[PDB]
Amino acid sequence: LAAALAQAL
Numbered sequence: 001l002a003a004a005l006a007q008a009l
């Protein structure tokens, strides 16, 4: 989940 969002950065 964290990675799914982290791709933005």
Ligand SMILES: *C(=O)c1ccc(-c2ccc(C(=O)OCC)cn2)nc1
Binding pocket: 001, 002, 003, 004, 005
């Ligand atoms: C959420 O974006 C998220 C959470 C966890 C994972 C993930 C990917 C790969 C592994 C892995 O290779 O584990 C080996 C024990 C674990 N968790 N991806 C994305």
Ligand SMILES: *NNC(=O)c1ccc(-c2ccc(C(N)=O)cn2)nc1
Binding pocket: 006, 007, 008, 009
């Ligand atoms: N928000 N994330 C990024 O901007 C980001 C872009 C690219 C990468 C990355 C990581 C690792 C490799 C590699 N070849 O091992 C390439 N690009 N991370 C984050």
